[PDB]
Design a binder for this molecule. Structure first.
Ligand code: 88Z
Length: 278
């Protein structure tokens, strides 16, 4: 890369979170995942006393695409919440270094046939997500792509709200590239986004949790979802979804953004629902 050909604002930021190349071992045959524009590798981060930290290392495959890449990392830099993915740092492709998430993404986790998360566990993951979003919303950050495929799960089954960004593999869900079936009605009609539109996404995420990762509206084509919603139609109540959790989802999908619950309300109500389970 030619550092000169990027905004000095992005440049000094990336220097506050820099990781010297000699502190980071990237294992290049050890590919976690590779999409069209980016890839992710296993990595080892050494600290100044020699202790090894297993990490994921995100990379570009390939000025514009480099400036976007670096910006995606920099956005994350000050998120510090246990339900939001954090940045370990950036190494000058430039390398964005993330903590390793043993269980990968939440959608793949809940679809895995060899494990049985209970209805309680699934509601539990939804609650963790609500807590990460309450934090993001407190910082006035709008996610715009909240979905189970963008939430990670660590060795302690802690959910980390994240966004694969350029490293998206799973791309059929986008059609601007737009995750239309997680989108609020007014984002679909205006291509504009808010915290209340993340709330709409959140309700769809909860439906993913309760169906163990079923695809939403599978008999609806990308572009047709707008008129479907305007006809007064919504996602059906999953078989094991408690009535009050389905009522939560419906409130998330209210046509008036301002009538959707806040993430603070979601946290309190879903905590109550979750506590009712043996
Ligand atoms: C595909 O599998 C994996 C991907 C991983 C990973 O990927 C990323 C996730 C997010 C970002 N974020 C980003 O690049 C950014 C982002 O996150 N920003 C952001 C946005 C909003 C927000 F609220 C917080 C952060 C774009 C910068 C970057 C990544 F590289 C990071 C850490 N560990 C991972 C482990 C994985 O599998 C382990 C194998 C698990 N198995 C399961 C069972 O079968 C065996 C395999």
């Amino acid at each position: 890369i030619d550092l000169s050909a990027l905004n000095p604002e992005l440049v000094q930021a990336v220097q506050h979170v820099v990781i010297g190349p000699s502190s980071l071992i990237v294992h290049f045959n050890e590919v976690i995942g590779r999409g069209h524009f980016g890839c992710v590798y296993h990595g080892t981060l050494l600290d100044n006393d020699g202790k090894k930290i297993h990490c994921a290392v995100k990379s570009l495959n390939r000025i514009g695409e480099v400036s976007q890449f670096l910006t995606e990392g920099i956005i994350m830099k000050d998120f510090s919440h246990p339900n939001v993915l954090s940045l370990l740092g950036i190494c000058l492709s430039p390398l964005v270094v993330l903590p390793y998430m043993k269980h990968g993404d939440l959608r793949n986790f809940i679809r895995n046939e060899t494990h049985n998360p209970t209805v309680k566990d699934l509601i539990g993951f939804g609650l963790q997500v609500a807590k990460g979003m309450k934090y993001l919303a407190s910082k006035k950050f709008v996610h715009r792509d909240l979905a189970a495929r963008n939430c990670m799960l660590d060795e302690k089954f802690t959910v980390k709200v994240a966004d694969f960004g350029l490293a998206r593999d799973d791309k059929e869900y986008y059609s601007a590239k737009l995750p239309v079936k997680w989108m609020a009605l007014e984002s679909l009609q205006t291509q504009k986004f808010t915290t209340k539109s993340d709330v709409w996404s959140f309700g769809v995420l909860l439906w993913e949790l309760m169906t163990r990762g079923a695809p939403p509206y599978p008999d609806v084509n990308t572009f047709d979802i707008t008129v479907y919603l305007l006809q007064g139609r919504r996602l059906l109540q999953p078989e094991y979804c408690p009535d009050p959790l389905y009522e939560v989802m419906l409130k998330c999908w209210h046509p008036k953004a301002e009538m959707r619950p806040s993430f603070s309300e979601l946290v309190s109500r879903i905590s109550a629902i979750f506590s009712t389970f043996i």
